């Protein structure tokens, strides 16, 4: 379907978009006490894999799944909350602020770099077709 | 012997396309952490050789092989990510973003130059076919 460079750069754009979405969702839920049901929100992470591809030497980026972070959930002593345990510590998400801003900046700069790569390749693509005519 | 220019410039175009593809693959995976085998992504680069069989004076260019770039793997301290080292040293690819962007630009420019060579050569072949007429 897609040309190889198109597929690689578009996969890069989609992967960076997914990472940015995960960072934004984490930054939104930084102060959430309970989730859909009653369990604390867990910071999400996105794992980048290289599309194996038949070539292997050349391949884009895919995202296998969004994993839930395994870090000590923040404990805040609020015994009056219905979600407090026997000891009374309500669970707050493990979303760090600085890491998510750094992730947003890095995802944005990778997105823009891949955009620039596509823009650079395009002119050569359109100029290839003038070879025959 | 203007026909050999077709082979020379076509080989050059294919080699520059392969180089651009490898550079884009490296750039799109600068943020990757995992491969299909669990190994960290290693930045790769093509090798250019003169496409000349033994006894041939000057030919085009050919891609001999794709080799792993020689650079220290970028160590990141994240002993919370499921992928880690004995001391929590996550290994990230050694991609130098500026180098890859410059490589992409250079490959595009060389590609366009070879296209111009092919175009003017075809024009000359048509003339030559209009030698006496």
């Amino acid at each position: 379907a897609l040309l190889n460079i198109f597929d690689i750069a578009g996969s890069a754009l989609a992967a960076q978009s997914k990472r940015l979405n995960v960072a934004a969702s984490n930054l939104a839920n930084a102060d959430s006490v309970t989730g859909p049901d009653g369990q604390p929100y867990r910071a999400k992470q996105v794992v980048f894999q290289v599309d194996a591809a038949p070539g292997q030497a050349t391949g884009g980026v895919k995202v296998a799944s969004v994993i839930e972070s395994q870090a000590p959930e923040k404990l805040v002593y609020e015994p009056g909350n219905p979600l407090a345990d026997a000891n009374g510590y309500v669970k707050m998400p493990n979303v760090d602020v600085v890491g998510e801003m750094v992730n947003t900046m890095s995802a944005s700069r990778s997105y823009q770099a891949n955009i620039e790569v596509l823009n650079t390749v395009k002119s050569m693509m359109l100029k290839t077709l003038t070879l025959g005519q | 012997a203007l026909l050999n220019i077709f082979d020379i410039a076509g080989s050059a175009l294919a080699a520059q396309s392969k180089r651009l593809n490898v550079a884009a693959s490296n750039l799109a995976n600068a943020d990757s952490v995992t491969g299909p085998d669990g190994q960290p992504y290693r930045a790769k680069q093509v090798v250019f050789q003169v496409d000349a069989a033994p006894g041939q004076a000057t030919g085009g260019v050919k891609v001999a092989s794709v080799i792993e770039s020689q650079a220290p793997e970028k160590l990141v301290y994240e002993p919370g990510n499921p992928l880690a080292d004995a001391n929590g040293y996550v290994k990230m690819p050694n991609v130098d973003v500026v180098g890859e962007m410059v490589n992409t630009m250079s490959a595009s420019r060389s590609y366009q130059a070879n296209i111009e060579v092919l175009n003017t050569v075809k024009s000359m072949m048509l003339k030559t076919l209009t030698l006496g007429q």
Partner: peptide
């Protein structure tokens, strides 16, 4: 060969 070109169709289809 081992490396497909940038202007080739998705080696990964």
């Amino acid at each position: 060969g081992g490396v497909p070109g940038a202007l080739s169709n998705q080696p990964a289809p």
